[PDB]
C-alpha cells in the first residue's frame, strides 16, 4: 500500500536502475553488463539478479521484495526493459518484454510448512517434479502446469508425500522435467474455486505457487553446503593409509562378520564414472548387486541400514511392487483430463539408490520392464499417444531367497535361483551366504549379539581391528567423494587383463565384455574411495580379487577347488 505511492515507486525504480548500472563486484567488474551482454548474445527473455548483492547494497529493497512482490517485480521488469532499450535499442526487435528473476532466497521453506501467513509472499521451496502439462497459449503467452511432491528422502516414514501445483510463464516454461529434483522461488498466492467450496461446504482457496526462478537441485548446492571443516576432516581421513579398513569396518556395526557383502555394497555405493563414448553408446557407471542367502543372515537388516544411510533411498517389497508402480505410467488428470505422467519408484530413484526386497517373488511380466532400465539407465514410455524418455540412473540392490529355503552347493548358482540368465548378467556383483554350524563362530555371534543388546537398551541410552567412523562423517565423505573425484585409467596393463580374460573364457566354456566393464568401474570406484585423481594398479588388483571371489562362489563344489588352485596367484 505504501509502495503504491507514485513518489516512492518512481524513486525506487530509478534507484534500481542505478543499482543495475553502478554495482561493482569484488573483482571490479560490473557483473550485470556482462550478464546483459550474454543474454543479448543468447536472445533470452529473462535476467537473473542475485538477492544477496541487492540485500548487501540496498537493505530497503531486500525488505520490500518479500512484502510487495508483484508491483515491485513489474517495476523492475520495466526498468530492465528500458535499460536494455537505452543500451541495445535494436533488442526491442527480438524481444518485447524482459522479466527479472530472483535467485538465492535466504528463506527456504518446505511444502509441509506452507500456511496462511505465507499467502501472496515470495517463498523458496524444494521438492521433486511428478507430472507436467504442455505448453499452452494465452490471449494476453506460454503456460506450464506442474505437480510437485516432497522429496522422498526428506519425508519421514509412515506419512504420505504431499503434492502442490506450480505455474510457469514464458521463459520458465519447459525449464524442468518430471522426476527432476528442483528448488523454486515463487509467490504463494491463493485461487478461488467454487467446486472446492461446494464439495467441502465452505469457502476453500486452492493455494498455487507461481514460481519466479527454477533451479534443478544438483549436488552442487550440497558441495556449497559443505563446511571447510568437513573438507579438512575428509582430506585428513583420505591421507590415512588404513582409510579403506576403517570405512569397511564402519558399515553395519550391529552385524558381525560377513566382510565380503559389506565390501561389495560399499564398493557399489561409491559408484563408478558413467561414460558416453562418442555419443553413440553410453557406458554405465553403476554397480548392480544381487544378494542370495540362507535365512537367518540379516539381509533385511543390511537393506534397512543402506536405506537409512543413503541421502536418497526408496524401499520396496516384492509383493507390493507392481510394474506400473515401479515405472512411470500415463494417467488422465481427474480435473483437467489430459494425459499425465506419474513417476514410478525407479524414476524417483534417479541419482539415488533403489532397494528391491524378495526379488525372487517378481512376476516375469514385471521383470520384462526391468532389463531396459538396468542396461540403459533410461525409460522410454510410449502410451496413449505420448512418447517420452526419462533418466533412470540409479544403483539397484536386490534381495532374494533360494528355492526351497536352502542353497544347494552341488548345483550351479543359476539353478538355485529362479531368475533368467540375462537378469543375472545385468548384475555386476554376486554374493552367496550360507549357514554353517561352527562352535567358535557361534560363540562369536552370541557374544556380539548379547553385547549389542546390552549396549542399545533405552535405559542405558572388529575383524580389521580399526575403529568405525561416525555416521555423519561417513555420509559427508561419501557426498564429497561422489561430487569431486573423477579417476583416469592411464596406467593399466592391458596384457594382464587380456590373459586373465582368456583364462576366464577357457574356464567358463569348460563349465563377457560387461564383466570387464564392471571390473573397470569397480576400479574407478575404489580409486574414488581414496580420493585419487588417477587410478593405481592396487585398485585393479583388489577389483580382480573380489570379482574372482564372486565368480568362484557361483560354481559347483567339484570345480571350485580346481579354480582356486588355478587362480591362487591372484587370491594370495
Amino acid at each position: 500500500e505504501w509502495v503504491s505511492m507514485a513518489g516512492p515507486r518512481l524513486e525506487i525504480h530509478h534507484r534500481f536502475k542505478n543499482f543495475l548500472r553502478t554495482h561493482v563486484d569484488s573483482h571490479g567488474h560490473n557483473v550485470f553488463k556482462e550478464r546483459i551482454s550474454d543474454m543479448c548474445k543468447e536472445n533470452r527473455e529473462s535476467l537473473v539478479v542475485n538477492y544477496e548483492d541487492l540485500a548487501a547494497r540496498e537493505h530497503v529493497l531486500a525488505y520490500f521484495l518479500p512484502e510487495a512482490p508483484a508491483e515491485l517485480l513489474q517495476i523492475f521488469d520495466e526498468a530492465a526493459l528500458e535499460v536494455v532499450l537505452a543500451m541495445y535499442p535494436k533488442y526491442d526487435r527480438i524481444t518485447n518484454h524482459i522479466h527479472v528473476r530472483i535467485s538465492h532466497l535466504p528463506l527456504v521453506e518446505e511444502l509441509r510448512s506452507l500456511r496462511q501467513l505465507h499467502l501472496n509472499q515470495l517463498i523458496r521451496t524444494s521438492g521433486v517434479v511428478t507430472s507436467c502439462t504442455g505448453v499452452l497459449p494465452q490471449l494476453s503467452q506460454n503456460y506450464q502446469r506442474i505437480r510437485i511432491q516432497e522429496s522422498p528422502g526428506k519425508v519421514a516414514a509412515g506419512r504420505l508425500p504431499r503434492s502442490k501445483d506450480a505455474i510457469l510463464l514464458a521463459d520458465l516454461v519447459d525449464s524442468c522435467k518430471p522426476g527432476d529434483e528442483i528448488e523454486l522461488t515463487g509467490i504463494y498466492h491463493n485461487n478461488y474455486d467454487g467446486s472446492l467450496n461446494t464439495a467441502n461446504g465452505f469457502p476453500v482457496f486452492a493455494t498455487v505457487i507461481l514460481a519466479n526462478h527454477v533451479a534443478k537441485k544438483d549436488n552442487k548446492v550440497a558441495v556449497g553446503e559443505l563446511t571447510d571443516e568437513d573438507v579438512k576432516m575428509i582430506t585428513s581421513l583420505s591421507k590415512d593409509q588404513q582409510i579403506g579398513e576403517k570405512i569397511f569396518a564402519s558399515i553395519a556395526p550391529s552385524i558381525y562378520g560377513h566382510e565380503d557383502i559389506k565390501r561389495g555394497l560399499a564398493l557399489a555405493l561409491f559408484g563408478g564414472e558413467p561414460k558416453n563414448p562418442g555419443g553413440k553408446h553410453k557406458v554405465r557407471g553403476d554397480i548392480n548387486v544381487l544378494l542370495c542367502g540362507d535365512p537367518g543372515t540379516a539381509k533385511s537388516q543390511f537393506l534397512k541400514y543402506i536405506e537409512k544411510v543413503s541421502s536418497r533411498a526408496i524401499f520396496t517389497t516384492g509383493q507390493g511392487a507392481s510394474a506400473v508402480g515401479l515405472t512411470a505410467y500415463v494417467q488422465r488428470h481427474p480435473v483437467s483430463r489430459e494425459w499425465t505422467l506419474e513417476a514410478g519408484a525407479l524414476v524417483l530413484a534417479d541419482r539415488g539408490v533403489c532397494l528391491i526386497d524378495e526379488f525372487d517373488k517378481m512376476n516375469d511380466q514385471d521383470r520384462t520392464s526391468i532389463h531396459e532400465a538396468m542396461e540403459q539407465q533410461s525409460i522410454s514410455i510410449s502410451k496413449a499417444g505420448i512418447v517420452t524418455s526419462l533418466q533412470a540412473r540409479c544403483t539397484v540392490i536386490a534381495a532374494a531367497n533360494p528355492i526351497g529355503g536352502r542353497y544347494d552347493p552341488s548345483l550351479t548358482f543359476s539353478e538355485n535361483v529362479d531368475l533368467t540368465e540375462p537378469i543375472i548378467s545385468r548384475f555386476d556383483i554376486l554374493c552367496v551366504v550360507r549357514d554353517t554350524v561352527d562352535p567358535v563362530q557361534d560363540e562369536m555371534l552370541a557374544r556380539f549379539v548379547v553385547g549389542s543388546h546390552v549396549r542399545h537398551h533405552p535405559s542405558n541410552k572388529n575383524t580389521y581391528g580399526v575403529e568405525p567412523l561416525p555416521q555423519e562423517v561417513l555420509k559427508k565423505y561419501i557426498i564429497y567423494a561422489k561430487e569431486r573425484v573423477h579417476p583416469k585409467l592411464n596406467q593399466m596393463d592391458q596384457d594382464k587383463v587380456a590373459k586373465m580374460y582368456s583364462d576366464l573364457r577357457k574356464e567358463s566354456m569348460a563349465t563377457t565384455v560387461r564383466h570387464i566393464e564392471s571390473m573397470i568401474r569397480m576400479a574407478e570406484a575404489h580409486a574414488r574411495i581414496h580420493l585419487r585423481d588417477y587410478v593405481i594398479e592396487d585398485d585393479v588388483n583388489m577389483a580382480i580379487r573380489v570379482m574372482l571371489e564372486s565368480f568362484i562362489d557361483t560354481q559347483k563344489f567339484s570345480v571350485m577347488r580346481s579354480m582356486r588352485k588355478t587362480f591362487a596367484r591372484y587370491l594370495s
Binding site: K275, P277, G278, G279, V283, A498, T512
Partner: protein
Amino acid sequence: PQEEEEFRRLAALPNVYEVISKSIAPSIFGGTDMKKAIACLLFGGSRKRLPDGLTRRGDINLLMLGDPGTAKSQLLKFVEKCSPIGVYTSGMVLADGGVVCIDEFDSRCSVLAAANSVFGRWDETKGEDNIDFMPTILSRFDMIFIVKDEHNEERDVMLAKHVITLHVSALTQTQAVEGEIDLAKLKKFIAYCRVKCGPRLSAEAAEKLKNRYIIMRSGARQHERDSDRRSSIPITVRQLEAIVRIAEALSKMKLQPFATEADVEEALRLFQVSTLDAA
C-alpha cells in the same frame, strides 16, 4: 534444387555401392555382406500393378538367426535411425513404405527380423531342427542369414582392440573414416532415389535368372532327396521374385532405367550366400 545436383553427382560415380556399404554402421566390425544386404533393403524394390487388379510386393523381407552377442539389436537400431520411416518392436499401420524391425521373433512395410536359436546356441553337428518357425512363414522372408560365434584368438584380440579404440577415440573426434556419407545426407539421398524413379529388368538378365533358378531348384530337389529329409527352407517362385526385387533395387541404386547383368549376378550371389548356406 542444389541437392538434386549433389545426389546426381553422388549416384553417377562407379563406386556408389561400396560407399553406401561402408556408410552402413561403420562402428560395427565385419559383416560387409550384412551391411550390403541392409543397404539394398533400405533402398528396396518397386511395386507393380496389373490390369487384372493383382498386386506384387515391392518390399524386401529379411531374417537373421544367431547366438546372442552378434550385434543384431545395434544393426536394427541403426536401420531405424537411418530409414526415413522406421518402427522398432520387441515382437504396421503407422508405417507406410518404411522399415519395421522386429526383435525376439520367437500395409506396404519392409520387414527386418532378428531371432535366437531354439536351444540358445547353434549346434553345427545337428544341422536342421534349430529353427522353430514353420516353412510357411519362412517362405515369406526373401533372405535368411545365420551368424555363429567364430571363436578365433586373433579375431577376439582384433574385436577387443576395435571396441577399445572406438571407446577411446569416440569422444575425441567424430569424422568419416574414408569418404563415409553423413547420416542426414544418406537419408536424403535414399529418399530422393526412392521418390525419383524405379528401374526394370532386361530380357538377357531375365533368361540368365531363369536358368539359374531352374538349376537351383533342381539342386535343392537333389539335396532333399539325398538327405531323405524335408528342408525347412523351400525354394519356390517367391525366391525368384525376391531375386528380381533385389536386382531391381541394385539397379535403382544407380538410377539406371534398365537393370544390367551385374545387378542380377550380385543379387544371385547374395541370395546364394544367404539362403543356400542357411538351407
